[PDB]
Structure 1
Amino acid sequence: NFMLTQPHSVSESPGKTVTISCTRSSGSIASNYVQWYQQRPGSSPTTVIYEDNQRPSGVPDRFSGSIDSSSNSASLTISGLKTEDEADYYCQSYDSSSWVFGGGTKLTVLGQPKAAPSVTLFPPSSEELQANKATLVCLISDFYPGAVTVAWKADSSPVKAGVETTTPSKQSNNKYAASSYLSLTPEQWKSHRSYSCQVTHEGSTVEKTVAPTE
């Protein structure tokens, strides 16, 4: 009956305060109570907030929750940010019949300056096209925090069929890297004016475009 949408990512410094929103797509957010779960890499999830704003035993008072009726949204707030708070956070609610989870929000506790991603985009090689295949290669590097969103475009129109995207990975220099691949047939590549790779990081978008006319 509904969805819960959270930001892909949020970040702040040790000691500062940060907030994660969770917006209900349909019906009032106050119709059904919200839970918030913490999940660390490897680890299974842990309740941090239940019943909109209640804390399970052993959850520090740094963690709290609230409801915003005007925006039909729930929110998790973490003050006195500490490096160990770094994790994925999922809001959760109920349909009266089915459990609904939010998309997830990667929380980064900053340890170095924010860093915009460098984007390099390559068109199909002449050699690959000769083989009746076609692959657009978008290489993303040097971005911190390690959270990006990648969108592909044929002209203006979004593309999701034939898109393969990795999760970010730590580079040798402690920043992150990722890559995304678009698979086309030579004709699909030949019959559009251009294709674009769109990398959203911390709100702003970085973009690169290639065209079959060089």
Structure 2
Amino acid sequence: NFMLTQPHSVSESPGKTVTISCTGSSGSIASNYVQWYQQRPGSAPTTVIYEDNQRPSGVPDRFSGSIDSSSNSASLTISGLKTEDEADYYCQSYDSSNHVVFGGGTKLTVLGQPKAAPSVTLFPPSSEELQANKATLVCLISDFYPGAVTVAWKADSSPVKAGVETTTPSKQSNNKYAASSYLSLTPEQWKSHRSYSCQVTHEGSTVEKTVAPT
């Protein structure tokens, strides 16, 4: 019944300190050794802490593992943060039944660039798609930092409530973030409105583009 819980996300500026907790549930954190892994996008996890506080060779000492028996928790402290530290971090240990319990994971973001408003491009359905009895609105979001945006669609200024598909933002090749949002419609529904708008809100500032059936 043992269980480990981590904060969903954590963030800080380069050169400062974060602490990712690993709270044990229905069990005892001190019963079994605790490990920490740093997995990055498109890579297999690698160990940063094993056996509560041991550091594999090469791992810098900025990474430190500790155990809090009082609160039944373990923590990985990362000081002197570098942008290269941006990754997913997982704790794991064992229960009483010879099972491997992994933590939920924590997304650590290192904010090492100035804020950047998103560049937005909106595309109406093509004639070739409408000829195939379909209609997809493509909204393209790029070059925003940090990578937290919310996307809203609006048909004749009324918020679209169905048929929206939005990607989770991903980091581009220039360390900016990019996302896509799709509004699927019928030829019927497309030609029944006079304007569509993709509204991207980033840090309390909104960038929007409008298309209109011709």
For residue 167 of structure 1, report the CA deviation from its aligned partner.
2.6
**Which 10-residue stretch deviates more, 187-196 or 6-15?**
187-196
Query: C-alpha separation between the residues in 2 aligned to 1:77 and 1:208?
Result: 43
Q: Deviations over 1:13-46 (max 9, x none)?
A: 2211111111112112112211000112222111
Does the aligned pair in 1 maintain the 2:3–2:27 contact within 8 Å? Answer: no
Query: C-alpha separation between the residues in 1 aligned to 2:31 and 2:194?
Result: 48
Q: Work out which of the two has the higher radius of gyration on C-alpha atoms and give 1 or 2.
A: 2
For residue 212 of structure 1, report the CA deviation from its aligned partner.
24
Distance 1:30 1:175, change over 3 A: same
SS of 1:84's partner is: helix
For residue 180 of structure 1, report the CA deviation from its aligned partner.
8.5
Match of 2:56 in 1: 56
Structure 1: 5+ residue runs without aligned partners? Answer: none
**Which 10-residue stretch deviates more, 117-126 or 47-56?**
117-126
Distance 1:97 1:68, change over 3 A: same
Q: Deviations over 1:96-124 (max 9, x none)?
A: 334x1111111112112568999999999
Distance 1:119 1:156, change over 3 A: same
Query: C-alpha separation between the residues in 2 aligned to 1:159 and 1:72?
Result: 46
For residue 3 of structure 1, report the CA deviation from its aligned partner.
2.0
For residue 189 of structure 1, report the CA deviation from its aligned partner.
20
Distance 1:110 1:153, change over 3 A: same
Distance 1:174 1:212, change over 3 A: same
Query: C-alpha separation between the residues in 2 aligned to 1:188 and 1:68?
Result: 58
Structure 2: 5+ residue runs without aligned partners? Answer: none
**Which 10-residue stretch deviates more, 181-190 or 79-88?**
181-190
Q: Deviations over 1:172-195 (max 9, x none)?
A: 996545579999999999999999
Aligned-pair Cα RMSD in Å: 5.9
**Which 10-residue stretch deviates more, 165-174 or 53-62?**
165-174
SS of 2:70's partner is: helix
Distance 1:117 1:107, change over 3 A: farther
Distance 1:70 1:41, change over 3 A: same
Does the aligned pair in 2 maintain the 1:106–1:147 contact within 8 Å? Answer: no
For residue 144 of structure 1, report the CA deviation from its aligned partner.
4.5
Alignment of 1:46-125 (within 5 A): 46-98=46-98, 100-113=101-114
Q: Deviations over 1:61-101 (max 9, x none)?
A: 11101112232211001111112111111111111334x11
Query: C-alpha separation between the residues in 2 aligned to 1:34 and 1:204?
Result: 42
Normalising by the residue count of structure 1, what TM-score does the alignment of the two structures yield? 0.59
The number of equivalent residue pairs is 212
Identity of aligned residues (%): 99
Does the aligned pair in 2 maintain the 1:36–1:49 contact within 8 Å? Answer: yes
**Which 10-residue stretch deviates more, 85-94 or 111-120?**
111-120
**Which 10-residue stretch deviates more, 37-46 or 187-196?**
187-196
Query: C-alpha separation between the residues in 1 aligned to 2:208 and 2:11?
Result: 22
Distance 1:58 1:197, change over 3 A: same
Distance 1:23 1:181, change over 3 A: farther
